[PDB]
Design a protein around this nucleic acid. Structure first.
Lengths: 211, 115, 53, 119, 122
RNA sequence: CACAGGUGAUCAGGUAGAGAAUACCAAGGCGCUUGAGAGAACUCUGCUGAAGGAACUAGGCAAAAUGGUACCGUAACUUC
RNA sequence: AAUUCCUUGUCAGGUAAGUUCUGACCUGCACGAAUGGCAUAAUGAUGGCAGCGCUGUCUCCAGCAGAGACUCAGUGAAAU
RNA sequence: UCGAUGUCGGCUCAUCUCAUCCUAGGGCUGAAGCAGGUCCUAAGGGUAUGGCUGUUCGCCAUUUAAAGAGGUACGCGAGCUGGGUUUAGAACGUCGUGAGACAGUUCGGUCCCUAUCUACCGUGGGCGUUGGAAAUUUGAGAGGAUCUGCUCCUAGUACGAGAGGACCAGAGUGGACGAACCUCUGGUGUUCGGGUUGUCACGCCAGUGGCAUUGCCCGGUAGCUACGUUCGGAUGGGAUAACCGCUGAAAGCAUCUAAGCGGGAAGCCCACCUCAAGAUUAGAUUUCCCUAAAGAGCCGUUGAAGACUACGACGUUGAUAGGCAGGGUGUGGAAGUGCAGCGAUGCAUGUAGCUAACCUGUACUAAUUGCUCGUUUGGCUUGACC
């Protein structure tokens, strides 16, 4: 139930001997250093905290420097927690190591990332609203929202109405993705599929919850 | 070369050597075909009208006429579906892409030989 | 299109509560000792111990 | 969106933007110190610096190529005569931008563009 | 990518020359038919004293498309025309000669007759 | 109103061009009295568009399309 | 039928499917001969219907360019 | 309501009901099977495109699992349309002597408003959360999602006189819908490369540039993007609806019910995804700091982050951006020179020259240890420990 944090390196293909192209995405896995083990006695729940990447010393606060020093690890670019159970808290000690060995070839994974940000978007792109007529006398409402409600009853707009607003740049999970290849010496994780986000983004790969 | 150096490691292990060819050239591509259980090679002869050079992602489209109707196939260069490619005639064209040949049929859809 | 009642002065000022004048950051040039806008040359053309005139 | 896109618009057509940056490049080559708007100063580097790079080696093809983009025979002569053999051993960064406040007329952020090494 | 009101050549010798798609079958809001997909056609142009006449409503299978058919390696395969082969009430081919190539998407049970009768199969 | 409207006559350069059309220039005259950024939605004005090709719609509205010269050739009908 | 209420009359044609269209019938609510009748070549920014071509009209919208929108500085309305 | 509450239809966008159209669970059947018919439960999803007509509807064609009935100012014109109705022109039929008239017809006929408040979609500022800070988090709760076809197999079995033809199990493949993504297939690609028309200029030739929609045309990088790719809608748990019970008395029998014990639906509550402590009950954990600290901010270089913000990165102890260097990609064969040709032109030098946004590096330029905010051990009461 624990995963690892990597960086989206970009997309490519893997060819099979039958001549099928598999769309894959490449994840750089630096070492996931364990910075804290949360247990039920102290925190009320079981989790593993890891860090990965690096920061320069001038960019790490005194509080975070002490947090990393208590574990014995080097400061990473971020800190991520994975909810675990007694089975997961087996060989996981503070200052310990999590590599790409966590996953096997052919294992289904869930991958989470920040989607690409589209900024402010209209209803047509954000919610697949139909466009109104391009011609036929249509005035200046070609990509307009259309009606936003009923009449006097209810005399308001219902909450959760689909409107323009910020699109993308949100946490998104894609489930049911296959591990195409694992390599740990090079920190390589090759996964079948799309992987939300841009290249260089932080991605979290966990074992698939559908199973 | 255009990608993340770690994408390049995955791409470079997958490269099939093939002979060089340009747009305008007439090529024969041997395509692996699996009917039910046996595998054979089907020939695809025609003019290379376009190609995108993208390393592992390279592709080239070949245009022939098959009994009246014209067919194009955009082969993926480094795909094991491509058993082999051999260049019959070398072309002398003035442009990378020969899309104008789609409106040409006979004595007008012919390109000069390169010597 | 238009209000059904005039806005009260209190509500107009609540809208204006975010209206501030930006205050620039200032430094002292090491050579001339003159005050200047941070990351900007001085009135005399001095910036980070260098002349432009 | 604008993801990974380069270039400026500056409220102009592309023809006007090209002509104005050609004018600014020539003005900077002649006077070696100009005062302009800060976004214009930042975009001036991507046009003026490649001309100095190509003038580092003097040839007929290079001189003609510089004149194709500058259209000032005086500035092309000056470029290939002194500027290239002034930045011969400099790997880029031939001009520096110094912020110099705001314009009186419209409060536009201003900057001086100076050629390095005695402008 | 064949939709309603698109015209197709006839790749067989049923008598038809041009057919018009009046329904893409196989789904409530189904949009396009590709190679191998069953469509309802009206015969717009028929050969004199043929088996089908102008105005028949029948079944056809798309056999080649201008949009093209994708292959597992990522290659695409495009034709210069959109073509169809007329079928009977049980969606079985009604011809004894096929004109022009077809693709391997017709391989299976019902259209094996079209595949065997085609001059060339891709 | 220092207002995209209206206001009679006269003069009539060049290269293309049938042309006082049009394009680019001469003489001459101007840059149209807010600018600077940014480069969201949405609006206006344009350009390009896979496959399809009127399925849109009250209606092909709008758009797209055609477009020159020479020659060949040209139907119903006609008051010739 | 620019005239027919009943009425989308009936029959034929055109479409896969045609309250519109064309042909015909005559049961003309409620045509008809200078408030002219029936036709009619040519003509019409006239009405109806049908095709070819052509297309972002549409399936189903995408990308791009300029002017706004947005931020800064200056000036500074409106109806209510 | 007449000191004005805009009409029908369409478009866009919906929201609710259940008297349920499909899918789900059932009882009865004139239920053999396959199919149905009725009624009970069930509102979680889903629930065509066209031809005609201004139509709603309706008929028709072809589908679909199905093409539900309704409410919402017969939802929705300060969101769009303006075909009909319902101004002024004109005509026909008809009525009137007439001016005129007609739920008769016909051709034609200006749809304004920059949004204050509520609402809603997003995105910030402030303050608070018992000293302050940097992070990581629990989850009271909230939202999203919930559809379904066909093929094979069981099995040509059960059933049936035949015709036909299963349940229950299992395997695969679609349609619609949604999300992410750009490797591929394409689209676009007005600071990329060429070709080319007219004209003007750079003294001239050559070579180039301006202008003509980017002049036009042919390609095309990155990005963005769908029609491309990949993924998702769970077969699980709990309690239930109708319905079916077990045992069982009231009521020696019977009886699902009164005591007690079971089964049971796409529905309910979880489970999946997202948000979530202003959950003022403001939660938890790990570190850091307190005679201006820990930090935060301004400023600067900026980003597949973005309206402004915020958010992410970096500021010399530096690859943050530009440049530069080396690649890649695209275009397709630069200029000059030479050769061949009367010349247009062709060939060679040489896959050349150019090359946006891509990759990998590199301090050359620009990121100034400047300033501001933020302190000084965090009240009291009680208990336990000390």
């Amino acid at each position: 139930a624990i995963g690892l944090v990597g960086k989206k390196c970009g997309m490519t293909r893997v060819f099979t001997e039958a001549g099928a192209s598999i769309p894959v995405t490449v994840v750089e896995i630096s070492a996931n250093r364990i910075t804290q083990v949360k247990n039920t006695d102290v925190d009320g729940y079981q989790a593993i905290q890891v860090t990965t990447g690096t920061r320069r010393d001038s960019r790490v606060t005194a509080a975070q420097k002490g947090h990393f020093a208590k574990a014995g690890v080097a400061a990473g670019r971020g800190v991520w927690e994975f909810r675990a159970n007694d089975s997961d808290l087996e060989g996981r000690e503070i200052g310990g190591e999590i590599l790409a060995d966590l996953f096997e070839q052919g294992q289904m994974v869930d991958v989470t990332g920040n989607s690409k940000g589209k900024g402010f978007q209209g209803g047509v792109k954000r919610h697949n609203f139909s466009m109104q007529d391009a011609t036929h006398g249509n005035s200046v409402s070609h990509r307009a929202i259309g009606s936003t409600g009923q009449n006097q009853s209810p005399g308001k707009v219902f909450k959760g109405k689909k409107m323009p607003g910020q699109m993308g740049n949100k946490r998104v999970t894609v489930q049911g993705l296959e591990v195409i290849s694992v390599d740990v010496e090079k920190g390589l994780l090759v996964i079948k599929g799309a992987i939300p986000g841009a290249t260089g983004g932080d991605v979290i790969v966990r074992p698939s919850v559908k199973a | 070369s255009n990608k993340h150096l770690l994408v390049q490691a995955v791409e470079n292990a997958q490269i099939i050597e093939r002979p060089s060819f340009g747009p305008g050239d007439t090529v024969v591509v041997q395509v692996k075909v699996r009917e039910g259980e046996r595998e054979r090679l089907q020939a695809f002869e025609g003019i290379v009208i376009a190609k995108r050079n993208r390393g592992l992602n390279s592709a080239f489209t070949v245009r022939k006429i098959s009994s009246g109707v014209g067919v194009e196939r955009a082969f993926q260069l480094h795909s094991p579906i491509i058993e082999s490619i051999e260049v019959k005639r070398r072309g002398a064209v003035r442009r990378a892409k020969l899309y104008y040949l789609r409106e040409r049929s006979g004595k007008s859809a012919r390109i000069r030989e390169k010597l | 299109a238009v209000q059904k009642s005039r806005k009260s002065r209190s509500r107009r000022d609540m809208r204006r509560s975010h209206h501030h004048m930006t205050v620039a950051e200032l430094s002292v040039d090491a050579t001339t000792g003159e005050k200047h806008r941070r990351h900007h040359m001085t009135k005399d053309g001095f910036y980070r111990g260098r002349q432009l005139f | 969106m604008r993801h990974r896109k380069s270039g400026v618009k500056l409220g102009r057509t592309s023809s006007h933007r090209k002509a104005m940056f050609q004018n600014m490049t020539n003005s900077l080559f002649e006077h070696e110190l100009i005062k302009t708007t800060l976004p214009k100063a930042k975009e001036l580097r991507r046009v003026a610096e490649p001309l100095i790079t190509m003038a580092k080696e003097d040839s007929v093809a290079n001189r003609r190529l510089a004149f194709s983009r500058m259209r000032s025979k005086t500035m092309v002569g000056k470029l290939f005569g002194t500027l290239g053999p002034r930045y011969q051993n400099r790997p880029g960064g031939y001009l520096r931008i110094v912020k110099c406040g705001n314009r009186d007329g419209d409060n536009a952020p201003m900057a001086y563009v100076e050629l390095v090494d005695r402008d | 990518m064949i939709q309603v009101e698109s015209m197709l050549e006839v790749a067989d010798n049923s008598g038809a020359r041009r057919v018009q798609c009046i329904k893409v079958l196989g789904g409530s809001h189904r949009r396009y038919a590709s190679v191998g997909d069953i469509i309802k056609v009206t015969v717009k142009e028929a050969i004199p004293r043929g088996r089908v006449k102008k105005g028949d409503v029948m079944n056809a299978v798309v056999v080649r498309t201008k949009k093209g058919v994708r292959r597992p390696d990522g290659s695409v395969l495009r034709f210069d025309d959109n073509a169809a082969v007329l079928l009977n009430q049980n969606k079985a081919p009604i011809a004894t000669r096929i004109f022009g190539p077809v693709t391997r998407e017709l391989r299976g049970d019902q259209f094996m007759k079209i595949v065997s009768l085609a001059p060339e199969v891709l």
